[PDB]
C-alpha cells in the first residue's frame, strides 16, 4: 500500500536562560 | 427580588459623581418593606413586598382596588 | 402485488405476513451458508413483507 508516514515537524517546545550572565 | 409589588419599581442604575466629577457605577434601590395589609372583602391579612410610595398609593386608593389591579397584572400577591 | 394484497382479509393478510416471514427466515439461514444462487429472493421477500405490513397499517385504524 502507501502509508506515507511523514508528519510535520512540531519540534520547538520552550527554552530557559540558565546561563552565567555577564552583569 | 427587589420589586415594589404595587408600582413595579425596579432598582435603577446610575453614577455616583464625586465632587471632582470622578464617575462610578451605582444601583439606586427602591425603598422596600414587607408590610402586612388588612383587607375586608377577604376578611383576613395579606402580605405585600411594598414600597413606601406603594403604602401611600394604597393609603390613597384602598387595598382591595390595588389587589384587583395586582390580580389583573397576574401575580400571587 | 399490492393491488391484490388490498383484496384480502385482515387475518389473511396477517397469515400472509407470517408465512412471508418464514420464507424470509429460511432464505436468511440459507444465505448465511453456501446455499443461495438465486440472490434476488431476499430483496423480493423483504419488499413484499414491507408491503403486507403497510397494508395492515392502513387497514387497521382506517
Amino acid at each position: 500500500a502507501a502509508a506515507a508516514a511523514a508528519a510535520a515537524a512540531a519540534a520547538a517546545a520552550a527554552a530557559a536562560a540558565a546561563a552565567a550572565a555577564a552583569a | 427580588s427587589r420589586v415594589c409589588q404595587v408600582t413595579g419599581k425596579r432598582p435603577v442604575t446610575g453614577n455616583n459623581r464625586s465632587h471632582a466629577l470622578n464617575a462610578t457605577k451605582r444601583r439606586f434601590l427602591p425603598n422596600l418593606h414587607s408590610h402586612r395589609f388588612w383587607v375586608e372583602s377577604e376578611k383576613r391579612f395579606v402580605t405585600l413586598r411594598v414600597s413606601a410610595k406603594g403604602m401611600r398609593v394604597i393609603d390613597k386608593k384602598g387595598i382591595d382596588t390595588v389587589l384587583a389591579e395586582l390580580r389583573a397584572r397576574g401575580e400571587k400577591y | 402485488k399490492a393491488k391484490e394484497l388490498r383484496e384480502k382479509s385482515v387475518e389473511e393478510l396477517n397469515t400472509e405476513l407470517l408465512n412471508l416471514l418464514r420464507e424470509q427466515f429460511n432464505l436468511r439461514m440459507q444465505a448465511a451458508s453456501g446455499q443461495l444462487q438465486q440472490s434476488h429472493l431476499l430483496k423480493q421477500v423483504r419488499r413484499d413483507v414491507a408491503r403486507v405490513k403497510t397494508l395492515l397499517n392502513e387497514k387497521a385504524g382506517a
Binding site: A1, A2 | - | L17, L18, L21, R22, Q24, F25, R28, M29, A32, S33
Partner: protein, 94 residues
C-alpha cells in the same frame, strides 16, 4: 408468550468455525449468530419453535467488532451477538 415475528427476527445465522464444529459434536451445542438486542429467553423460545428441537439452556456473549483499515480510511466493523444453544441429552439438530 413471545411475538412470533420477533422470534422470526432474532435468529440471523449459524456460526462456522472449528470451535463451533467441536462444540456441535462433543456437547450437542449449536452455535448461532443472533440479533444485537436479543436475550436468553427469547433465543431459547425461538430455537425451540423454529427448528422444533428441545433445548436445555442458552449461553450468550457479545463479539466486539474489529477496527479495520480499508483503503486508507479507518473503519469500524459492526458488533453482534453469539449464542451457544445447547440441546437435550441425545437429540440431533443439524
Amino acid at each position: 408468550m413471545i411475538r412470533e415475528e420477533r422470534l422470526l427476527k432474532v435468529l440471523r445465522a449459524p456460526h462456522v468455525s472449528e470451535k463451533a464444529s467441536t462444540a456441535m459434536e462433543k456437547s450437542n451445542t449449536i452455535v448461532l449468530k443472533v440479533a444485537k438486542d436479543a436475550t436468553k429467553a427469547e433465543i431459547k423460545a425461538a430455537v425451540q419453535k423454529l427448528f422444533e428441537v428441545e433445548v436445555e439452556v442458552v449461553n450468550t456473549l457479545v463479539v466486539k467488532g474489529k477496527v479495520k483499515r480499508h483503503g486508507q480510511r479507518i473503519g469500524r466493523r459492526s458488533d453482534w451477538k453469539k449464542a451457544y444453544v445447547t440441546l437435550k441429552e441425545g437429540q440431533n439438530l443439524d
